[PDB]
């Protein structure tokens, strides 16, 4: 269900590690851990779509790019994220994008 | 359902290859490594489908004459092709190819004996 | 006595139901395919215009598909030999028979 | 016939609706698209001709006879298309004003442009003031209906 | 060849237990059943722009030839028919815009444009190079402009092409701007969107083309113009 | 009476939709599409070819060859052809 | 006596189209996965799209084993780019082969620096020209010598395509340049 | 503001799985230990075959193996390209920049290659 | 009908073809046929 992408996140990874603790201690089952991961995805996706409201503008140089399975994958270098309340320069960034 | 259809196609292919030996459902699951199909499904396939399928013959605890009504013999059914005054009545290009080897070599030989081919 | 009003009115209705069929049949063809609808393109202006123009010109009745013999000669070329002639034809009354 | 009967006929009883065969073999979730059409107000210009250029102009019933045109006027109608889908929206209706055909005009009736003019004006248009009218002109011929 | 047959009399005409008196009619010309179907589309399109019958016959003649070559079989029949019509209009010396043909047809500008060029190559024939004067008449009419303004516009268009003030520019843009200039110097004012709607061209393309012609406006008017709005007070944008 | 817009809006809309997702399903799949197709034939005893392509969202020639390999066809006196995938 | 009234003015090449066959079947999804400057979408098109900074180019690689290379501004660099593509394919682990390389099309352009008469050109060359001021702004001229297609604009700029070798551009231009100067405004 | 959303997410996840834990018969203590663990975790050549005459047109791989640089995970709305100039129309959006965490609902976007 | 027989003439279609043939030859000789519809011209008039 959905992009599953948010499983790669720190937020997503800290969950799986927490779930892994519970599995090693056999407090839960792997199937139960997966169902929790599914519900977390729905909840985090709903939270993103309904709650979040801020936007950001960005520029830079493209180093490398990829597109497969409806998933876009880039790697930009010397990027500048510009906002009305923030400014962020970075030497290199990896971007995965699904829809 | 799908699994059984894959079994039948496999079974035809294995018969074509030459392995006309009698075998069981449990053996096919094993050889195809699909034993994890579940005992409920396994049983339903075994004691409903592959008994109502007229292509296999049940002998004691095992399935015979494998892919369909056949007599096999090395696709060298020369007497059958003869078949006195009955004359086969009529053989099919598709069945001889399914039988074992491609027809073409046999047909070419058959064209210089007493057989004729029509495009039905 | 059927004057221009009730005759044309029967005739125009004949023309309009037919037009109604051409819009329906066209929109049905569109939906079968789907998402590319237009409405001025569905209507055939020739249907109304020519169907009446035909009836008045020839003298025949109906759109030709539903007969014509029941109202033959209801339409005529106005005679004008003399002013009294024109004036008489405009005042003509006819009476159907076998 | 023009003032009542024609308006009455298109207003009367032919509202139509149409709906594609969606959700075929599968589907679900919501919409088999449907469309409704209904006809209203009707409009009828003074008699008009269109040159090969496409330029429309006031036609004169004499010109119609010498060139063999057809003394008629163009007819237009109010049409509405009315999108009440099976759920997500009931309003998305659109107003149009559309040309539907050309109706023959009976000479010197209230829609034949000659009626509003006096003896000197008709005499100036080269159309006789003492003509009785009441007859259609089709293809260069004056065509009169028998009662 | 053969005639048709149909609805009888009282009838015995075999509907033994069925309800089909005698027999249904039959087709006889399937191979050509889409050439008759082309003519059905051609007259319909033709009436939406009200062409004289002669053009429609010319179109039938162009279509019959293109069909008969089969040199472009596969492309939309209605597109081929629509393009034939477009050519016929130029050969009759009464050009129409492609935008006008889209208005009446269900085929888009791209396909008609392709078919147009393809038909000319295939039919080994070429139309005349279109000019501004060819549209002056039709537009001023739909704008209910008097004869004097229309004639001024024609003169303006003629001068404009003569001085080569806007080279390359499409003849429709120059036509739209000349009409705009004319209407704006008369009592009969017209808006950019109104002309734009009639000519089909975007009103901003008129605005640019007008901006292009304004520097020499005085020179373009006929000496017979009555200047209802003087150049010294001619609007600019 | 009719304004020219180079193309019908709604036709353009047809283009806008078409220009997003295509029925040109790439079939270096065969097995999973088929695994799905067996699942489909579990839902009803027989299907029509127009829906069978429609439910699979894919080119007809490979599926036809599949129907040629394992399946069968039957005109139920309804002119239109109908298919079954039963290996019996 | 010179060939023309003012000779050439260094017609410049702008784009080259070539193809090459790699000789074997490949797995584009893997390619897409491995590659860093590529993209792949079965739902959109069958070939995988690659683009390198070298001579700045783009390639179309088919599952059949054929590839197409476009964008180079010379035939050597296109041969160069195609070899570079064959290189990265090798580097993926695939048995790439530089087989059947061939230039399919060349595109050129130049300017003459003066406005020109197009209504006359189409008048005097009715058989070839197909000027459609309504649709595409420039005149389309179909030469039948080195069978070349030209696009001529009112500013004087000229574009040429359909060529297989540079000489055909210079020749096609060498034919057209006097005529064009002859309609100078 | 954003840890709050993370807090918000803790609320939704915990509530939404309660019934699931119930269905496995797993006590609510395990659910709360999960939450607490999780919270603490959060904070010129005529030869048609030799091509060694073109070696070295590729670079380090190497860029991808590490991915030590900051990462961005999101969705795309529109992707566009003109010459070596790229244009990006994005939507939804979690960013991590030098340890910090950031979010957006729409992003618009320009780059050259 | 000849090509039809020559080829794969069914049965009902042959009976139909005979009935159509019987009608056309009769209507050629006589188009009045009290108990049957009349052969017509495309314009609508009865065939002579």
End-of-domain residue from the set G44, G71, G103: G103
* I39 closest CB neighbour out of E5, E10, E23: E5
The CATH label, of 3.30.460.10, 2.60.260.20, 2.30.18.10, 3.40.50.2300, for the domain at A54-99 is 2.30.18.10
- Look up residue B18 and give its two tokens: 């030459």
**What does the alpha-carbon distance between residue E199 and residue G132 come to, in Å, rounded to a whole number?**
18
Contact F11 E48 (CB under 8 A): no
Burial of H10 (0-12, 13-18, 19+ CB in 10 A): middle
Residue showing tokens 């269109």: D50
> Residue G82 in contact with residue G98, Cβ under 8 Å?
yes
- Look up residue H43 and give its two tokens: 């904070």
The CATH label, of 3.40.1260.10, 1.10.540.10, 3.30.70.60, 1.10.287.190, for the domain at A1-53 is 1.10.287.190
Please name the residue ranges forming H helices in chain E: 33-48, 53-69, 77-91, 98-104, 109-122, 133-142, 147-163, 171-184, 192-199, 203-213
Q: How far is CA G177 from the centre of its chain?
A: 21
Backbone dihedral angles phi then psi of residue G34, each to the nearest 5 degrees? -65, -50
> Residue G16 in contact with residue G73, Cβ under 8 Å?
yes
Query: Angle CA(H23)–CA(H26)–CA(H29) in degrees, nearest 5?
Result: 135
End-of-domain residue from the set G70, G103, G136: G103
* H110 closest CB neighbour out of A8, A55, A59: A59
DSSP state of G116: B
Residues of C in contact with D144 (CB under 8 A): 75-78, 89-90, 92
> Residue A82 in contact with residue A58, Cβ under 8 Å?
yes
Q: Residue H23: how many CB atoms within 10 A of its CB?
A: 11
Q: Residue B4: how many CB atoms within 10 A of its CB?
A: 21
**What does the alpha-carbon distance between residue G4 and residue G171 come to, in Å, rounded to a whole number?**
11
Q: Which residues of I18-39 are buried (b: 16+ CB within 10 A; e: fewer)?
A: eeeeebeeebeeeeebeebbbb
What resolution in angstrom units was achieved for this structure?
3.9
E5 contact partners, CB below 8 Å, separation of at least 6: E25, I37, I39, I40
B66 contact partners, CB below 8 Å, separation of at least 6: B11, B14, B15, B20, B22, B55, B56
Distance between B114 CA and the closest CA of chain F, angstroms = 32
> Residue B99 in contact with residue B72, Cβ under 8 Å?
yes
Residue G55 sits in a domain whose CATH number is 3.30.310.10
Domains and CATH numbers, chain E: 29-126 (1.10.472.10), 127-234 (1.10.472.10)
Residues of E in contact with G115 (CB under 8 A): 164, 167
End-to-end Cα, chain E, rounded Å: 67
Q: Which chains touch F (3 or more CB pairs under 8 A)?
A: B, C, D, E, G
Q: Tell me how many helices (H) and strands (E) chain I has.
A: 2, 0
- Closest alpha carbon to E215 in E166, E167, E158: E166
DSSP state of E232: G
What 3-state class would DSSP assign to A49?
helix
Known binding positions of G: 15, 51, 66, 105, 142
- Closest alpha carbon to C10 in C51, C46, C50: C51
Sheet of D72-82: strand order equals D16-19, D34-44, D72-82, D93-104
- Closest alpha carbon to D138 in A22, C91, G142, C60: C60
Judging by DSSP bridges, how do beta strands D136-138 and D141-145 pair with one another?
A: antiparallel
**What does the alpha-carbon distance between residue C83 and residue D131 come to, in Å, rounded to a whole number?**
8
- Closest alpha carbon to G22 in G101, G100, G97, G104: G97
**What does the alpha-carbon distance between residue F22 and residue C56 come to, in Å, rounded to a whole number?**
54
Phi-psi region of H59 (alpha: psi -120 to 50; beta: other; left: phi over 0): beta
Segments of A10-86 assigned E as strands: 56-68, 71-82
> Residue I42 in contact with residue E3, Cβ under 8 Å?
yes
> Residue G65 in contact with residue G22, Cβ under 8 Å?
yes
The Cα-based distances of D40 to A47, H84, I13 in angstroms read 50, 57, 51
DSSP state of B73: G
Backbone dihedral angles phi then psi of residue A75, each to the nearest 5 degrees? -145, 110
Cβ of F30 under 8 Å from any chain B Cβ? no
Residues of H in contact with G56 (CB under 8 A): 84
**What does the alpha-carbon distance between residue I33 and residue D127 come to, in Å, rounded to a whole number?**
55
DSSP state of G15: E
Cβ of G27 under 8 Å from any chain A Cβ? no
Q: Residue B48: how many CB atoms within 10 A of its CB?
A: 10
Q: Which CATH class is domain H1-43?
A: mainly alpha
Residues of C in contact with F11 (CB under 8 A): 36
Q: Which domain holds residue G148?
A: 6-17+104-185
Domains and CATH numbers, chain F: 22-84 (1.10.10.10)
D92 contact partners, CB below 8 Å, separation of at least 6: D83
- Look up residue E113 and give its two tokens: 């444009």
**What does the alpha-carbon distance between residue F8 and residue A48 come to, in Å, rounded to a whole number?**
38
Judging by DSSP bridges, how do beta strands G99-110 and G158-163 pair with one another?
A: antiparallel
**What does the alpha-carbon distance between residue B84 and residue B90 come to, in Å, rounded to a whole number?**
13
Backbone dihedral angles phi then psi of residue G93, each to the nearest 5 degrees? 115, 0
The Cα-based distances of G114 to B43, D32, E190, G14, G180 in angstroms read 89, 61, 38, 21, 10
| Structure obtained using | cryo-EM
Residue numbers of F between 9 and 68 with CB closer than 8 Å to C: 10-11, 13-14, 17
Contact E47 C38 (CB under 8 A): no
Backbone dihedral angles phi then psi of residue C78, each to the nearest 5 degrees? -65, 115
Phi-psi region of A27 (alpha: psi -120 to 50; beta: other; left: phi over 0): alpha
Judging by DSSP bridges, how do beta strands F81-84 and F47-48 pair with one another?
A: antiparallel
User: DSSP characters for G141-165?
Assistant: EE-SSS--EEEE-TTS-EEEEEESS
**What does the alpha-carbon distance between residue G124 and residue H61 come to, in Å, rounded to a whole number?**
61
Please give the helix or strand (H or E) that residue D58 lies within, else none.
strand D56-58
- Closest alpha carbon to D52 in E54, G155, A70, I31: E54
C94 contact partners, CB below 8 Å, separation of at least 6: C73, C74, D146, D147
The Cα-based distances of D49 to D38, D70, H59 in angstroms read 29, 9, 76
Distance between E106 CA and the closest CA of chain C, angstroms = 8
**What does the alpha-carbon distance between residue E79 and residue E66 come to, in Å, rounded to a whole number?**
12
Contact A10 H38 (CB under 8 A): no
Give E222's Cβ-side CA count (13 Å radius). 16
Q: Chain E: residue nearest D50 by CA?
A: E50
**What does the alpha-carbon distance between residue E160 and residue E219 come to, in Å, rounded to a whole number?**
10
What 3-state class would DSSP assign to E179?
helix
Contact C40 F14 (CB under 8 A): no
Residue G1 lies in a domain: no
Residues of G in contact with F22 (CB under 8 A): 43-44
- Look up residue C9 and give its two tokens: 């009115």
Cβ of B77 under 8 Å from any chain F Cβ? no
- Look up residue D133 and give its two tokens: 């009218």
Q: How far is CA H19 from the centre of its chain?
A: 30
User: DSSP characters for G35-59?
Assistant: -SBEE--TTT-SSEEEEETTTTEEE
- Closest alpha carbon to G11 in G185, G182, G177: G177
**What does the alpha-carbon distance between residue D98 and residue C44 come to, in Å, rounded to a whole number?**
11
Distance between D52 CA and the closest CA of chain E, angstroms = 6
Residues of D in contact with C4 (CB under 8 A): 1, 106, 145
The Cα-based distances of G70 to C3, G57, H81 in angstroms read 78, 6, 16
Q: Go through chain I and tell me how many residues it has.
A: 48
Please give the helix or strand (H or E) that residue D41 lies within, else none.
strand D34-44
* E106 closest CB neighbour out of F3, F5, F8: F8
Q: Chain A: residue nearest H22 by CA?
A: A32
* E52 closest CB neighbour out of D52, D56, D57: D52
End-of-domain residue from the set G103, G119, G148: G103
The Cα-based distances of D111 to C12, D69, D107, H75, H82 in angstroms read 17, 18, 8, 65, 62
DSSP state of C69: G
* D26 closest CB neighbour out of F1, F50, F55: F55
**What does the alpha-carbon distance between residue D128 and residue C86 come to, in Å, rounded to a whole number?**
13
Give H87's Cβ-side CA count (13 Å radius). 5
User: DSSP characters for E44-57?
Assistant: HHHHHTT--HHHHH
D81 contact partners, CB below 8 Å, separation of at least 6: C39, D35, D36, D37, D93, D94, D96
* A28 closest CB neighbour out of H8, H12, H24: H24
Please name the residue ranges forming H helices in chain D: 5-11, 61-66, 119-124
What 3-state class would DSSP assign to D43?
strand
Q: What share of chain I is helix, strand, coil (3-state, %, to 5)?
A: 50, 5, 45
What 3-state class would DSSP assign to G122?
helix
Q: List the beta bridge partners of residue A94.
A: A75, H71
Q: Are H and D neighbours with ≥3 CB pairs closer than 8 A? A: no
Backbone dihedral angles phi then psi of residue F48, each to the nearest 5 degrees? -90, 145
- Look up residue H50 and give its two tokens: 């030799």
- Closest alpha carbon to E10 in I38, I39, I40, C96: I38
- Look up residue I43 and give its two tokens: 């314009």
DSSP state of G129: B
Q: Chain D: residue nearest F50 by CA?
A: D25
């Amino acid at each position: 269900m959905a992009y599953q992408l948010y499983r790669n996140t720190t937020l997503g990874n800290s969950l799986q590690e927490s779930l892994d603790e519970l599995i090693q201690s056999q407090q839960i089952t792997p199937q139960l851990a997966l169902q929790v991961l599914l519900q977390f995805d729905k909840a985090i996706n709903a939270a993103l779509a309904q709650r979040v409201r801020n936007r950001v503008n960005f520029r830079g140089s493209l180093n490398t790019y990829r597109f497969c399975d409806n998933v876009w994958t880039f790697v930009l270098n010397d990027v500048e994220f510009r906002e009305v309340t923030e400014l962020i320069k970075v030497d290199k960034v990896k971007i995965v994008a699904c829809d | 359902f799908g699994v059984l259809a894959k079994i039948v196609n496999y079974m035809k292919t294995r018969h074509q290859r030459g392995d006309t030996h009698p075998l069981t459902l449990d053996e096919i699951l094993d050889e195809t490594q699909h034993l994890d199909i579940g005992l409920k499904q396994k049983q339903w396939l075994m004691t409903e489908a592959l008994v109502n399928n007229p292509k296999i013959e049940v002998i004691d605890g095992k399935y015979a004459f494998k892919p369909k009504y056949n007599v096999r013999d090395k696709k060298a059914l020369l007497r059958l092709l003869d078949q006195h005054d009955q004359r086969g009545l009529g053989g099919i290009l598709l069945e001889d190819i399914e039988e074992a080897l491609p027809n073409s070599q046999k047909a070419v030989k058959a064209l210089g004996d007493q057989i004729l081919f029509v495009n039905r | 006595l059927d004057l221009a009003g009730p005759l044309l009115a029967f005739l125009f209705r004949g023309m309009f139901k037919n037009l109604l069929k051409e819009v329906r049949i066209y929109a049905q063809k569109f939906i079968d395919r789907g998402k590319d609808f237009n409405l001025e393109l569905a209507i055939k202006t020739r249907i109304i215009s020519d169907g009446l123009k035909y009836s008045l010109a020839t003298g025949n009745w109906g759109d030709q598909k539903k007969a014509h013999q029941a109202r033959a000669g209801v339409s005529q070329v106005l005679n004008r030999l003399t002013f009294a002639s024109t004036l008489s034809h405009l005042r003509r009354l006819n009476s159907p028979i076998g | 016939f023009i003032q009542m009967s024609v308006q009455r006929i298109v207003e009367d009883a032919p509202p139509i609706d149409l709906q594609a065969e969606a959700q075929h073999a599968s589907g679900e979730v919501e919409e088999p698209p449907r469309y409704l059409l209904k006809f209203e107000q009707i409009y009828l210009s003074k008699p008009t001709h269109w040159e090969r250029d496409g330029a429309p102009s006031p036609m004169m019933p004499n010109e119609a006879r010498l060139r063999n045109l057809t003394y008629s006027a163009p007819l237009y109608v109010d049409i509405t298309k009315t999108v009440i889908k099976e759920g997500e929206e009931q309003l998305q209706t659109q107003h149009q004003k559309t040309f539907i055909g050309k109706i023959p005009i009976m000479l010197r009736s209230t829609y034949c442009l000659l009626n509003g003019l006096t003896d000197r004006d008709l005499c100036e248009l080269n159309e006789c003031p003492l003509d009785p009218g009441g007859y259609f002109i089709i293809n260069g011929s004056e065509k009169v209906l028998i009662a | 060849l053969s005639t048709m047959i149909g609805k009888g009399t009282g009838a015995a005409s075999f509907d033994e237990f069925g309800n089909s008196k005698y027999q249904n009619r039959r087709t006889m010309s399937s191979s050509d059943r889409a050439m008759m179907n082309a003519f059905k589309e051609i007259t319909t399109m033709a009436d939406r722009i009200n062409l004289p019958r002669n053009i429609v016959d010319r179109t039938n003649n162009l279509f019959k030839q293109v069909y008969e070559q089969k040199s472009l079989k596969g492309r939309a029949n209605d597109a081929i028919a629509s393009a034939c019509l477009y050519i016929a209009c130029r050969q009759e010396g009464v050009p129409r815009t492609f935008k006008e043909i889209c208005a009446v047809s269900r085929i888009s500008k791209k396909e008609i444009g392709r078919c147009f060029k393809l038909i000319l190559k295939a039919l080994e024939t070429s139309v005349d190079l279109i000019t501004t004067g060819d549209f002056m008449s039709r537009f001023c009419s739909n704008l209910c402009l008097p004869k004097q303004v229309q004639m001024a516009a024609t003169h303006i268009a003629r001068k404009a092409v003569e001085l080569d003030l806007v080279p390359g520019r499409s003849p429709i843009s120059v036509a739209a701007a000349a009409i705009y200039m004319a209407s704006q110097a008369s009592a009969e004012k017209r808006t950019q969107k109104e002309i734009g709607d009639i000519a089909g061209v975007a009103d901003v393309t008129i605005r640019q083309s007008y901006r292009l012609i304004y520097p020499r406006a005085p020179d373009l008017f006929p000496t017979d113009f009555k200047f209802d709005t003087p150049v010294d007070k001619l609007p600019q944008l | 009476t009719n304004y020219k817009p180079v193309a019908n809006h709604q036709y353009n809309i047809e283009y806008e939709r078409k220009k997003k997702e295509d029925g040109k399903r790439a079939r270096a799949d065969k097995q999973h599409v088929l695994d799905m197709l067996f699942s489909a034939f579990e839902k009803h005893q027989y299907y029509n070819l127009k829906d069978l392509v429609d439910i699979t969202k894919q080119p007809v020639v490979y599926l036809k060859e599949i129907l040629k390999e394992i399946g069968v066809q039957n005109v139920k006196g309804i002119h239109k052809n109908t298919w079954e995938l039963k290996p019996e | 006596t010179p060939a023309s009234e003012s000779s050439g003015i260094v017609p410049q090449l702008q784009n080259i189209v070539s193809t090459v066959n790699l000789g074997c079947k490949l797995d584009l999804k893997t390619i897409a996965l491995r590659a860093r400057n590529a993209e792949y979408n079965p739902k959109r098109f069958a070939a995988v799209i690659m683009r390198i900074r070298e001579p700045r180019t783009t390639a179309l690689i088919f599952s059949s084993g054929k590839m197409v290379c476009t964008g180079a501004k010379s035939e050597e660099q296109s041969r160069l780019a195609a070899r570079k593509y064959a290189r990265v394919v090798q580097k993926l682990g695939f048995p790439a082969k530089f087989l059947d390389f061939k230039i399919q099309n060349m595109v050129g352009s130049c300017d003459v620096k003066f406005p020109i008469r197009l209504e006359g050109l189409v008048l005097t060359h009715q058989q070839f020209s197909s000027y459609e001021p309504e649709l595409f702004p420039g005149l389309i001229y179909r030469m039948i010598k080195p069978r070349i297609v030209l696009l001529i604009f009112v500013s004087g700029k000229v574009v040429l395509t359909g060529a297989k070798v540079r000489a055909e551009i210079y020749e096609a231009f060498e034919n057209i340049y006097p005529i064009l100067k002859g309609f100078r405004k | 503001t954003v840890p709050k959303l993370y807090r918000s997410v803790i609320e939704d996840v915990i509530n939404d799985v309660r019934d699931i834990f119930l269905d496995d018969g797993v006590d609510e203590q395990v659910l709360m230990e999960l939450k607490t663990l999780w919270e603490n975790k959060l904070m010129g050549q005529v030869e048609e075959e030799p091509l060694n005459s073109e070696d070295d047109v590729s670079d380090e791989e190497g860029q991808e193996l590490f991915d030590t640089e900051n990462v961005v995970v999101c969705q795309y709305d529109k992707i566009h390209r003109s010459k070596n100039k790229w244009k990006f129309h994005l939507k939804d959006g979690i960013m991590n920049l030098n340890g910090r965490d950031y979010i957006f609902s729409k992003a618009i976007g320009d780059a050259e290659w | 009908l000849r090509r039809n027989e020559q080829n794969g003439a069914a049965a009902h279609v042959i009976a139909e073809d005979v009935k159509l043939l019987q009608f056309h030859v009769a209507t050629m000789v006589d188009n009045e046929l009290p108990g049957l519809p009349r052969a017509m011209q495309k314009s609508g008039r009865p065939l002579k």
